[PDB]
Amino acid sequence: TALHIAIERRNMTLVTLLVENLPLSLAACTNQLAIVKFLLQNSWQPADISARDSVGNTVLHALVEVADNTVDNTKFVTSMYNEILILGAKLHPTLKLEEITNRKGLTPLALAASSGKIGVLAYILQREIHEPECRHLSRKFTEWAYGPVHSSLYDLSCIDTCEKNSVLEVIAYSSSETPNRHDMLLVEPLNRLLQDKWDRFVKRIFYFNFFVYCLYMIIFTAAAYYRPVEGLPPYKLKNTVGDYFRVTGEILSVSGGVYFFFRGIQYFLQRRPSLKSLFVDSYSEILFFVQSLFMLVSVVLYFSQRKEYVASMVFSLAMGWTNMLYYTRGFQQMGIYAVMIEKMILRDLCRFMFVYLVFLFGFSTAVVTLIEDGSYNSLYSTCLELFKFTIGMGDLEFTENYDFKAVFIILLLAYVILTYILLLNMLIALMGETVNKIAQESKNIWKLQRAITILDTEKSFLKCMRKAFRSGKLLQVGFTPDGKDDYRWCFRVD
Amino acid sequence: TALHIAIERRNMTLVTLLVENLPLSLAACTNQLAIVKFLLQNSWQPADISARDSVGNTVLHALVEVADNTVDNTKFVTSMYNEILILGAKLHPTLKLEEITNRKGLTPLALAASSGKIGVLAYILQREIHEPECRHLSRKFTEWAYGPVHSSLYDLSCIDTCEKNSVLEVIAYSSSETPNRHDMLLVEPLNRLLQDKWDRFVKRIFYFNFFVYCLYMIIFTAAAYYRPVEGLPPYKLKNTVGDYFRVTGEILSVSGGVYFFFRGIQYFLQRRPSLKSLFVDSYSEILFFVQSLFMLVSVVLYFSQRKEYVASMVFSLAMGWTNMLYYTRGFQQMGIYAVMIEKMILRDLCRFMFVYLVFLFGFSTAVVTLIEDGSYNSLYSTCLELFKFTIGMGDLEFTENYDFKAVFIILLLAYVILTYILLLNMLIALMGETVNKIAQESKNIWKLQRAITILDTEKSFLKCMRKAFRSGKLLQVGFTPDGKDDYRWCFRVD
Amino acid sequence: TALHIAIERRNMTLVTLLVENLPLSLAACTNQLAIVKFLLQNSWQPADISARDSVGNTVLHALVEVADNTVDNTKFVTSMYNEILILGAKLHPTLKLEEITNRKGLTPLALAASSGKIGVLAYILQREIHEPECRHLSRKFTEWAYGPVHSSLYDLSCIDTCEKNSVLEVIAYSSSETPNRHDMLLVEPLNRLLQDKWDRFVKRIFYFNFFVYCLYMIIFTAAAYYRPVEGLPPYKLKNTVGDYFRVTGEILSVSGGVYFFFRGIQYFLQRRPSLKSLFVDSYSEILFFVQSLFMLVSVVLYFSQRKEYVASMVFSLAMGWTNMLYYTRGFQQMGIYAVMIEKMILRDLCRFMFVYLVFLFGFSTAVVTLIEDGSYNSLYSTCLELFKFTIGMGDLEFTENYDFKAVFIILLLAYVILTYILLLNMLIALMGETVNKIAQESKNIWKLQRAITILDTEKSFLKCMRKAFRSGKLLQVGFTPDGKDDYRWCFRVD
Amino acid sequence: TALHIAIERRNMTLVTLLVENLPLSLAACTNQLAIVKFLLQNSWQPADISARDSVGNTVLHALVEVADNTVDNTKFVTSMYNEILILGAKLHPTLKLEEITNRKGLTPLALAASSGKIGVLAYILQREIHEPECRHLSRKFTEWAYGPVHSSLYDLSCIDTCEKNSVLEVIAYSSSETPNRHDMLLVEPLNRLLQDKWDRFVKRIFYFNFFVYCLYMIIFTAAAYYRPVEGLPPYKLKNTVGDYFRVTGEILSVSGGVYFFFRGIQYFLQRRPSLKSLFVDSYSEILFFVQSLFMLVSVVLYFSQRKEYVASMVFSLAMGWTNMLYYTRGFQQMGIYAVMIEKMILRDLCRFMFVYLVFLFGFSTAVVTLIEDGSYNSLYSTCLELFKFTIGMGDLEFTENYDFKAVFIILLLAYVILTYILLLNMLIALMGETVNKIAQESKNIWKLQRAITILDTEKSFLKCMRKAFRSGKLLQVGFTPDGKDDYRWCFRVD
């Protein structure tokens, strides 16, 4: 604990003395100006920058962990971290620090992404060095330098894969509680990399899946609409071609359904979230899974000699058509607006329907208290009749049942004022404010949904080809601690 | 009056002369540098800052009273008052200046709170001293001071209670006209202290009360819905279990009602405001009280052999369900929205309904002037028929009564244009502007409502336990004008 | 024209040379630094500052006329005008320049107000001088000057009257096209003077008129509602007391009506605007006049043995109730909101109803040509049926008339989409934006309406008493070009 | 390629040497401080500023082309371009640089306008020079200089025409994809020139065309409404005057229609856009053309012994009335608002109706799956019944068909909540946001529509008169490189 007491004292000069009898903690938790530059040139023994702390984490992992996304902190942090790392690298050219993973098995780039970081993530991905024997750690390179025309290349190592994972997967597949999961896709390379991956392959296949899905939905809808009318399914088939077409439609329907069942469940088992993200996010897959569940229940009942298979079936069909909106991602205007609707439903409907339902139940049960007979005596019907005022078909004399029509009318009028004049207009105004406040979150989430689409298409891809690399076997430096050549698949930007 | 002339003239040197033959007023009303620094060093006798003025108020009470809570005033005021405090402490270590109450029986902290103060209130609550043997008047302390990690403690004396009252009660139970009753709860200690008290005990008890209330309301609703149908209450009971269940429901209903009656009335007799806070504030308790009044009237009629107990009863039931919204305080998303609605009704309904009612009455009486017969001849029915247009069931040919259908149609069309197309859209737009105007005040008022909940739960609490103290008997200073130790219940923040 | 060439050339040295052989134009149109100081202090003959130009206007009138309400212009203008005028006052202390009116018969203050000016009007009304022999032109005085406590006076000459008119009348009774007809009431004395005049007398009598008007309207409404039912007015009276009540109501009704007729017409003949203010402004008096016109037509027909007096009468009654909203001035919330409605109708209804009427007429005539028979064949009925879609009672199958029901349905659906889904929502959104745009102007117009109310009450006042002076015979200066005292009924402010 | 390498190296001194053995590229693509001033004074031979590059672009064309509308770049660009051009002009006063056109046959002013440029376009139009023998290139002058009054003339060459085209045509008739086609009319002269041409000539004839069109539309509407009722058109005429009136109406109708046909098609052949403007712009003419097409189809069927000419005719009539809104340009309030509506439809209706139609189709298919009988069995009628909920005539019991009314009601209620409560309010809110987002763009597009109106009227004009010139044969300089006088039709600006 000699360094613990030493940095507790934190005197600028005595550090050159106490070392005569954890450096990672000194550089990380404190980041003093003099200590970090001197720990590698101690009079007893210098500090091993590549070494691990008491749990196994290296210097870079703590250096990342400390940084906390504040401007004045960040301005200091970038320069201090860059200087200590370039000194440590020039001194020990044989080894690289960022490739060794922490206790959890994550690189410093992966940790920075998972915790959710901007200045650090940007710094790690966009490192630029313009000195010989110091390009060993750089990522940004320049080839052309005109007055008006500037171009550059990025290696993008570990953004496709470091053979375990990639930073893009980490940003996209965060826990959904990360403060800045969306903003991390605003870095210089990732936006254009996603854009090129969209331009190349993902755009066409995504629209293809959309067209296939539309045909699937049409086929299912046709199969439903011409369903038979007799009781006790399944039904004896005749050799008339109509039965063959209908059976074709049913078979395609259930096949597509269980295919979606497998796609959803295999998504789930590929992450196993602890019931957090399933409600914070992941709605788009949950809904398709629910569709598949309903389809299967329907066919189970269909073979089970039950009439009510129709009841299950239609729900899926309804849900099926609604889930068409899932594909509105991929379009500049449509997808953003659809996500805006989905977020407005999720944010608003619970809180609104609570108030509205309190009022409806209160006034409905009040009025059904008032009226009596030996109809509208039922609570359900009166709940409907007071509902109808919200769709603009309220009656104001929906019964003639006596016993104090005066208070009856007073109650209806108060209900109307509360619900139809005051509450709904208030809802409209709140939705207006919500919209004006969520324009930007809608843009972000649309970009994220595109990122998810691209990642799924590349990850599954079901063809085993190499249709992922950016720009071929481009040689960039050729000046490593060894004199060997390099091929690292850089990407050109202008 | 030699001091009066001295400070009315404000000559820098002659002040040493007139004193050779009120210092509180001198330091308070003007706050000059030489006056404040010089009244303690007079050639005849120095000023006794602990003494009382002509009415009984001490120096600090006037020093608070003069303060006006503006920025450029605030900085100089803080400096001068801190100098006053440190000089008084060092010179008169035997006693403390702020503990003596004024004529009204209020401390300087209480007076600053009741008037409504931010800079002054914050200063009084967060005094800091950086000298040994002068911590006697400190309230802010430090324990851990790293580069990135800082933590501190606050004594919080008189925020829970000084055995008569506390500053938190003063802020929360202000006169409801104080300009900044809400903003005063955003200071460093009170916000976190309320948050902690919410976390510890109040949250569970409040939710429990909510669940109990919901069960009460359900019980009452059930009792109402299955009320008997015969005339002339009360009704003979039979040994059938249904009658005992109904009687159980009625008994629980009236018991809960009169319990709320006592809760409301006991609140009132604990304040008895002179109609100021009664109407700008205290809406929830008035509403619950009104519910209980209606319940009791229903009981009275029920025993009084009157059928009209139904009419009274339902009103309470209606009000009962509405008052369920009271509990939406305590939920970050819901309660703010509920308060926003309540404020919108209060601000808007009078002004809107005035215009709408003028139009409705004018056109109803105009049209019923026009039409005649030997129905819709009545004013009431025509008031309804012109009402119906605003719920989207207007008819435009609701009668065939002759005598100038041309002007009749002209009148209806003008009414529709004024009311249905112009006025309602105008209402919607105004709510749209009002919402964006009141978002922040709504946040403040919800925080205030939670504060009221916390205070009510803690003060009554019906257990006689000590479930109020923050962090146990923590010793903070131990260096008093005497050498005795201290225990003051500090609270840690960081 | 020697001086115009002199000041076009504007060389500093030739100024004293050329004057060896109009100065108002020189000082006014150009306002050079050196020239104006010499023109009154020439070695040959100085210029007469009190003189008139070729049309009769004095120096101050041109000095006002030049100023054009720009910040950098204004900063220069205030200093140059104040210095040249104080120099002229010192040189010619016997006479005052501002009292002589221009060719139009207006004082410099009146001209500044009529053109609509802020810095200039504020300067003219709020002159402050703190030197002996220079208070002769001051209008602002100070009595108490502490840090926080200030107390002062305004003389306010010509704000009550200069025996022809006052500045407040000029501001309020402008031509309604003046750019600053509203903002001119934001000066220091006028706002408080209006407030005090409101507090003193105008508030009570205005509310009294309001109560009287309400009683008048109720009386009229009652008289209308129980109108007789037989044909051929007037009707023989019986000694039944009901006839006497009705005749009382009619007599009071027509008396109040013709009284309003005289009030409106006497307002008009008291200004005779050239159709400019009559349409951009003066809406209230036009409406009251129209009410009275309808009343008169009704009584004419009533004696003329015509039934149609009913048709006229009701219109007035309808208009009468609408004009109730006129009195919403005087209230902090209500009047502003009423003005917002009136402005919304005025600016919006023409533009909206144009689009809506184009669509309605186009689709209605399209459908009515489509359908045919040997009803809905009429254009009017179909105009109604397509109207009903806007109030939410459209039918979509209002006719079974054949001949291409397919295009018929296409047309109705297109109409619905254009009008009911798109146009009305667009109207709502535009009303929202307009409301956000007119948030501040409405307060100005309400303050102006109060100013109009106060001015009318003081103008008529029907008592002949002297209940108008501000604050008694307060002595202010005592140092004039003569050594006499001063009593001018200045006003106290703090 | 000697200069390519020379300007790749960009050495400040070696330029005096390398020239001993393209300058249009050197000045433009790089714009170095030293090179451009020295290229005209080389020791071997100076650069010919008037020369053309390998394709035919002059120095000005490249100088324009490089500029890319950035503020700091533009500040540099103005001074560098002005200095090089004035030096080159003073050296070669015989020739002018702007007159020779590029490879495309455009002047540098026209090219700057077509690409869409502000600083450069403004510079080219508003050049000012304050030196003798250097005003030869100026466009802005000063002729009057008083204290308050500054006024001048503008030459405005090529703004009316350079005998091929003009800058105003280029700005107005851009490709519709230019980033700033509308902002470019904010330059100093063009706004006032459009205002003047409006004031003088275009206003009257435009309103005249509007009145003529209105009469045309009325005539056609009357002709339609009294159309015959017998089958098998055309119909035998009788000499009754009514038939001649109707035939007059028909003849006027078809004549106006085919005139519009020729108008639209001749406009098209005068541009031949490459399928871009026909979708991003040009709606206001496409719609009139579509009207003409429908009219022609109607007359074809009318002679073709078909009844369906009614079906064609009405559509034109419907479209005809809608196209009335075309003339709302020319009005300060109306035109802006109409264009706002047109943009709202174009931007919003596709995206909204997609979501709405997905929901409607899904739920209609679901319900019609559920219900059956031995009507509402049809998909179409159920599509209508679920439609009606959006116009406020939803029924909630539109059938009594059994088989699981519970899920049926659940489906309808979910539909109502999704469509009538959520989506429709979101439409309203989005229109609310969109309006505030397009407050300012609409003014620009309205000014552009006026510009189109003025240009069309002036270019066609069918009179052969000279009703275009600004201010007569005004002489500007009279001091050319030759000693000849000048007459260039300047315009007076105050």
Side-chain angles (χ1 to χ4, degrees), chain A residues 67-230:
Chain A
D68 50 331
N69 301 320
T70 299
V71 176
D72 301 336
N73 299 20
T74 297
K75 292 174 173 186
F76 182 70
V77 159
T78 305
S79 305
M80 290 298 294
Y81 285 15
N82 180 67
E83 293 156 20
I84 63 183
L85 295 168
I86 198 66
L87 179 59
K90 293 167 72 173
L91 296 167
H92 305 285
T94 58
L95 301 165
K96 293 187 173 186
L97 300 170
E98 54 265 40
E99 294 183 27
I100 294 161
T101 55
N102 74 323
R103 189 181 179 85
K104 301 182 168 176
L106 281 84
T107 68
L109 175 54
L111 295 163
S114 190
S115 293
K117 306 188 182 293
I118 302 303
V120 173
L121 188 57
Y123 165 65
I124 295 162
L125 289 173
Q126 293 187 231
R127 199 184 294 99
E128 184 171 2
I129 297 167
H130 281 285
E131 186 185 6
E133 305 297 350
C134 298
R135 301 170 71 178
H136 298 171
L137 301 175
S138 186
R139 283 175 184 264
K140 181 174 174 189
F141 304 82
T142 305
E143 185 171 10
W144 296 99
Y146 297 89
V149 174
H150 288 267
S151 68
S152 59
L153 293 92
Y154 294 81
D155 58 4
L156 313 177
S157 188
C158 193
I159 293 166
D160 71 340
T161 176
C162 58
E163 311 303 323
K164 183 176 175 182
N165 50 44
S166 66
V167 66
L168 189 61
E169 283 196 356
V170 173
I171 293 156
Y173 299 113
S174 61
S175 60
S176 314
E177 297 175 356
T178 298
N180 50 12
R181 65 182 170 278
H182 310 75
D183 300 330
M184 281 188 288
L185 299 171
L186 302 175
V187 296
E188 190 63 32
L190 263 59
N191 176 65
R192 290 196 185 72
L193 177 62
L194 290 172
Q195 184 52 38
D196 168 84
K197 283 185 182 292
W198 183 252
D199 298 315
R200 185 177 293 180
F201 176 76
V202 179
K203 178 176 74 174
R204 296 184 177 82
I205 190 64
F206 172 72
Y207 300 157
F208 171 77
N209 266 311
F210 173 52
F211 176 74
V212 167
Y213 182 77
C214 283
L215 287 173
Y216 168 62
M217 286 304 317
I218 291 158
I219 292 155
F220 179 32
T221 307
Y225 172 94
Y226 302 89
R227 61 178 190 73
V229 301
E230 298 84 308

Side-chain angles (χ1 to χ4, degrees), chain C residues 33 39 55 76 102 165 168 177-178 222 251 268 286 295 302 315 328 330 332 334 354 358 384 394 450 468 472 483:
Chain C
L33 299 168
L39 282 167
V55 294
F76 182 74
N102 74 323
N165 50 43
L168 188 62
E177 298 178 6
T178 302
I251 288 163
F268 170 68
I286 290 161
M295 182 73 77
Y302 178 73
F315 274 108
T328 57
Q332 183 57 49
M334 301 299 304
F354 180 67
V358 164
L384 272 182
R450 293 178 63 189

Side-chain angles (χ1 to χ4, degrees), chain A residues 272-341 343-371 373-420:
Chain A
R272 299 286 298 276
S274 292
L275 313 173
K276 292 187 175 174
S277 69
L278 294 178
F279 303 105
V280 179
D281 214 283
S282 336
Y283 281 94
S284 49
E285 299 293 329
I286 290 159
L287 298 157
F288 287 125
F289 188 71
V290 170
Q291 178 196 352
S292 315
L293 296 176
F294 270 88
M295 178 72 76
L296 299 162
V297 174
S298 181
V299 79
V300 162
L301 297 160
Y302 176 73
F303 280 117
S304 305
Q305 304 189 11
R306 304 294 297 185
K307 188 176 175 184
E308 45 266 29
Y309 78 105
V310 175
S312 306
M313 181 174 72
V314 296
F315 274 110
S316 168
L317 170 56
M319 292 186 204
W321 271 114
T322 299
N323 309 350
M324 188 65 73
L325 306 181
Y326 161 74
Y327 299 81
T328 58
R329 64 190 68 201
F331 301 94
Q332 182 58 51
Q333 181 180 38
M334 300 299 304
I336 294 167
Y337 153 89
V339 166
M340 194 173 280
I341 287 163
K343 296 294 288 186
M344 279 176 79
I345 291 165
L346 289 176
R347 280 186 185 175
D348 172 85
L349 189 68
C350 169
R351 75 177 178 184
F352 170 80
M353 287 297 293
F354 179 66
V355 165
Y356 174 82
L357 285 161
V358 164
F359 277 117
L360 165 52
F361 198 69
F363 285 87
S364 195
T365 199
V367 173
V368 80
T369 311
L370 188 57
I371 59 173
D373 203 313
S375 157
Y376 307 116
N377 300 261
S378 49
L379 172 62
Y380 167 70
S381 311
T382 295
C383 275
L384 271 182
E385 295 294 351
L386 260 65
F387 186 61
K388 284 160 80 189
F389 283 70
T390 303
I391 62 161
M393 283 290 280
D395 283 314
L396 299 168
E397 286 199 12
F398 67 87
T399 181
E400 251 312 292
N401 290 91
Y402 303 97
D403 307 310
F404 315 114
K405 70 191 182 175
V407 297
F408 170 90
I409 294 292
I410 292 160
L411 283 171
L412 289 179
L413 293 163
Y415 166 53
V416 165
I417 291 160
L418 287 162
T419 295
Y420 188 77

Side-chain angles (χ1 to χ4, degrees), chain C residues 347 351-352 354-355 358-359 361-362 365-366 368-370 392-394 396 403-404 407 409 411 413 416-417 420-423 425-426 428-430 433, chain D residues 221 224-225 227 307-308 310 314-315 317 321-322 325 328 333-334 337 340-341 344-345 349 380 387-388 390-393 427-428 431-432 435-436 439:
Chain C
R347 73 190 282 167
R351 74 174 177 183
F352 169 81
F354 180 67
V355 163
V358 164
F359 279 117
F361 198 69
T365 197
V368 83
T369 173
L370 187 58
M393 288 293 280
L396 300 169
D403 302 313
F404 316 112
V407 297
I409 294 293
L411 283 171
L413 293 161
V416 165
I417 290 160
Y420 186 76
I421 312 299
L422 296 166
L423 190 57
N425 304 329
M426 196 65 184
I428 283 162
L430 293 166
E433 192 174 39
Chain D
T221 310
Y225 172 92
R227 62 181 190 72
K307 196 175 174 183
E308 287 76 331
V310 172
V314 301
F315 277 110
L317 170 54
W321 274 114
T322 300
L325 305 183
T328 60
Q333 181 180 42
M334 301 300 305
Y337 155 87
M340 197 176 282
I341 283 161
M344 194 66 73
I345 292 164
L349 188 70
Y380 168 68
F387 185 60
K388 284 158 81 188
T390 312
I391 61 162
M393 281 287 278
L427 168 59
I428 282 163
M431 291 179 74
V435 166
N436 177 250

Side-chain angles (χ1 to χ4, degrees), chain A residues 351-352 354-355 358 361-362 365 369-370 392-394 396 403-404 407 409 420 422 425-426 429-430 433, chain B residues 221 227 307-308 314-315 317 321 328 334 337 340 344 380 387-388 390-393 427-428 431-432 435-436:
Chain A
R351 75 177 178 184
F352 170 80
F354 179 66
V355 165
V358 164
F361 198 69
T365 199
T369 311
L370 188 57
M393 283 290 280
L396 299 168
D403 307 310
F404 315 114
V407 297
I409 294 292
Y420 188 77
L422 297 167
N425 300 322
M426 193 64 187
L430 293 167
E433 188 170 48
Chain B
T221 308
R227 64 183 188 73
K307 196 175 172 184
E308 285 75 329
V314 294
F315 274 109
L317 170 56
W321 272 114
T328 60
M334 299 294 299
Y337 162 96
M340 195 174 281
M344 196 67 78
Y380 167 69
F387 183 62
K388 284 159 81 187
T390 194
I391 62 159
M393 279 287 279
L427 164 59
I428 283 163
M431 293 175 74
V435 163
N436 181 252

